[PDB]
Point group: D2
Chain length 264, copies 4
């Protein structure tokens, strides 16, 4: 007795997955490859990026192309679009800004954060949405942050840039959904990525605590009692990119184990 | 070259799907049956309910049991729980309250709406959540309404009862997610169900317009330019019920084609 | 200086559940702006004392209704004393905390009656007169838990969220006729009830009252509890002729404790 | 009657972009409560006239700074005139409407500079003094579009939402030191700019001004546009000593037009 399970309907489509050699972006890449989506993946570090592409090719039956570039620069965006001029799916992602107190920031800190986490996604949407509209199908997913719903004092630069992206997305989403293009944001709370692990160990050593003690501290503030996985993050991305999600647009899906306490 | 696609991981589990011989509830039932979930489906009208169960059995490889009862009464809830004492998945649903002006309502109108669309789901959660916790897995999905986010003047009884359910769910969701139980709400905007079609035709005849003219009027207020399908509603339900959604809880997923204009 | 004239002197306000705490703060602030009052509470001697104090401090009239506002006969008593209010402040005691697995159907109905249907019915009874006169101000005291429900407050989370969704729909319907409906959502305010509850939970836990107060206050970014005076001041502003473009609002007075952007 | 004393007589407010419209309404309302003002705008003759009018009506001092507040030298001019404000009202002109497919990178940067980074930098320059004095009130004029973005307002949707998320984080950090940071979100207010814009879009479309006004007003449940006086009254209330438990709030003054519950 075999069960049909869920065919997301997007085999043969193409996705441009930004910032995706590791972490959540890689989780989205893998989940889309398993649905038969051909990939162009972007990251800055060439040897890690090509290793990830090797591995996804082995693990899936799709094509994978790589672009080694800084997606937050004009030249990097041009290189990504040269390699993937007409994506059906765009996953926006880039490294987040540094923590600190805004009184200690220079103006250029704001500009860099706005470029990386707001204007870069907007520009890649600008560059790709008309082809999606012309084909009657498009899926744009922006990786943002649970901080959009509950800003953290020390993350001023992210609170601002990502809330700016979110406000822009809300307006555009309603304009293009009738042409078959959806635009939605995935808001991760704390996910078990290598970057998070590296940061945790540095923070433990700076406080004098063991890594286990600091891990437990973070987890106690998450009702789910665990960190998120890049796999379940990628699964939600793949569902938003599916033919079953064409009525869902401008949404901000919070994947945070219950941590944020608001009703909405 | 066959693609893995998405295995929701819930084959062999059991779902109690309320109010599910037709419409959105039937859409959830079918989507769960395709993932290999055995069903107990509830509705009041026996012959329609048994026809739906016949059809789902033919269409899927799962078992389907029926309970013909009014789920908004104590006896009906008891009959549903006798038939499905330990569900892994609970889909809460029931008919919505009548439209009108609250100045014309009697007290009993409020009580009936609160019973049907708030206390009935709470009681079925009360009756089933401890077994979910004991097994380390539970998925509760409540069908509510886009009105929760943007209340309509003439839907006072739904605005109130469903917002009450939503507030209760937000608090409980954070309490049980660490035990493997999630509780989330699906907020439909306008979906193409037989009830909606019947209501539209009555409204057209009461206004003197053709059905096509009234259909178009409603659609012009939906940016997606179409009504929702019970299939895509069921797909979102199945994804929330999957092993890929254990980090998602207390959320209010709006499936409305962009119609509600808020950022959040 | 031309200080702020809220323009409501000589209007009449029905202030529910207002011999003490936040309701009393609303009554004091409205009387200070010249509003004649009818104040409701169950316990006669506290009610009369509070009325006497307000009347002596403000020279408005202050009628009292000793009744349980969450019952139909109580609402009839209150409406008989104030059949045509310009201003209605909805308020009543809150439901008991606990685990929803231990709440009966009747517990749910009591909470819904007290904190959702009672305000709806008082609005139902008074709004058409406000409309007819081209002015009305309805303020519902709810709870910061409407924005961030706590698991132990299931009954409040449900009933007050229901009121909040109802209010959202009605507010838009009547604002063009000069009636606004807004909710005030208190976080922790230093009412005598809260103070007594703290001192009991202190001596119960074996810590002092000051120790428990510090624990509560650590979770409030403003570093203090709210005062009934500032709660009443916000209510008076909503009631003013300056607030007729403000409706369906949920003003959080919680010292920044709720973390959400919205 | 003891009318409402907001307790801010003799404080000093820096009011940005305030020779006309909502900023002017804020300045008028604060002066009426005894607050000394420094008001900023670009055009000298309008700025002086508005200052003269406020000074004559309120007997506070009203200094003027003729500058473009969205440039670094403009901010330096404003801060030189008002280095230690108790109250800061952030405001500037809004960005142009249009299709984001036609906006350049520089268009985005101009909007972000004008409606997000300018207020952040003015907060950055003034908040530590507020903290040191144990009192501060920061009010940011944003837009009802922050709650419901319009596709033609992409630049505003982005920049003002960014400011709003930044403010949410900072508000909780400083409220314990007596500083509140809140946003006022206007829906359609009858400022002379709006009126002129309407009369041009009227004669352009071939309809009269009254016809276009009726079309706009049909979509506002309150049935009217807002007034700068009531906008300024809300700003003054937030600035008061009664509003120290209110921070990080986004008060929608839009006559009920926005349909959301929250
Ligand atoms: N993980 C969480 O708990 C969490 C929570 C909230 C928000 N977020 C946000 O989500 C995003 C992803 O986080 P993550 O933990 O998955 O990060 P990650 O583990 O560090 O992965 C980032 C990936 O993007 C690439 N990349 C980074 N900056 C890039 C750039 N300018 N151009 C091109 N590729 C770039 C990195 O490779 P190269 O370094 O080789 O370029 C790597 O492949 C970040 O913006 C983060 O702030 C994450
Ligand atoms: N469809 C939309 O556009 C839309 C939008 C917003 C909200 N909603 C809400 O979503 C829910 C589902 O709507 P729908 O359009 O799918 O409704 P539907 O097409 O009428 O289906 C309702 C189903 O539930 C059963 N049912 C109704 N009341 C019941 C009760 N007391 N006990 C047991 N079974 C019951 C009905 O069969 P019997 O009559 O035989 O019992 C039928 O199987 C409603 O609460 C509705 O108000 C729907
Ligand atoms: N203070 C806070 O921190 C806070 C925070 C969140 C929510 N709230 C909610 O705000 C409301 C007011 O709280 P509070 O602290 O001001 O309470 P309070 O100090 O206990 O004052 C309650 C007032 O209402 C009267 N009252 C209570 N139930 C009544 C009824 N059924 N009929 C008529 N009068 C009634 C009481 O007098 P009698 O007993 O003589 O009738 C008293 O005058 C409550 O619902 C509470 O749950 C308060
Ligand atoms: N009124 C509404 O319906 C409404 C609704 C939503 C949002 N908003 C936003 O609220 C703000 C105020 O709107 P309003 O209608 O009050 O505008 P207004 O009537 O045009 O007033 C703008 C005031 O700011 C000054 N100003 C503008 N840009 C400036 C700059 N760069 N530096 C210094 N002063 C500057 C103007 O004088 P100068 O030109 O001489 O400098 C004038 O005194 C705008 O950002 C607008 O987009 C307003
Ligand atoms: Cl830490
Ligand atoms: Cl209609
Ligand atoms: Cl405690
Ligand atoms: Cl127009």
């Amino acid at each position: 007795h075999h069960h049909h399970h869920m065919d997301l309907g997007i085999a043969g489509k193409t996705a441009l997955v930004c910032a995706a050699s590791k972490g959540l972006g890689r989780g989205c890449a893998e989940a889309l490859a398993a649905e038969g989506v051909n990939l162009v993946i972007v990251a800055r570090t060439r040897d890690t990026l090509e290793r990830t592409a090797d591995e996804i090719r082995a693990a899936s039956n799709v094509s994978v192309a790589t672009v080694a570039c800084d997606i937050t620069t004009p030249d990097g965006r041009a290189a990504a679009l040269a390699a993937c001029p007409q994506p059906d799916i765009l996953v926006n992602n880039a490294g987040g800004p540094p923590p600190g107190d805004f009184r200690d920031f220079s103006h250029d800190d704001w500009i860099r954060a706005l470029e990386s986490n707001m204007l870069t996604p907007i520009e890649l949407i600008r560059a790709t949405v008309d082809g999606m509209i012309a084909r009657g199908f498009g899926r744009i997913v922006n990786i943002t942050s649970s901080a959009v719903k509950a800003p953290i004092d020390v993350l001023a630069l992210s609170n601002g840039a990502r809330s700016g992206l979110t406000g822009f997305v809300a307006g555009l989403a309603r304009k293009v959904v009738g042409q078959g293009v959806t635009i939605n944001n995935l808001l991760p709370g704390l996910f078990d990525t290598d970057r998070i692990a590296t940061t945790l160990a540095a923070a433990a050593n700076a406080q004098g605590v063991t890594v286990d003690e600091l891990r437990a501290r973070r987890t106690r503030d998450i009702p789910a009692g665990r960190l998120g996985t890049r796999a379940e993050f990628g699964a939600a991305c793949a569902f938003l990119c599916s033919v079953h999600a064409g009525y869902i647009t401008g949404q901000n899906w919070l994947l945070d184990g219950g941590a944020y306490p608001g009703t909405f």
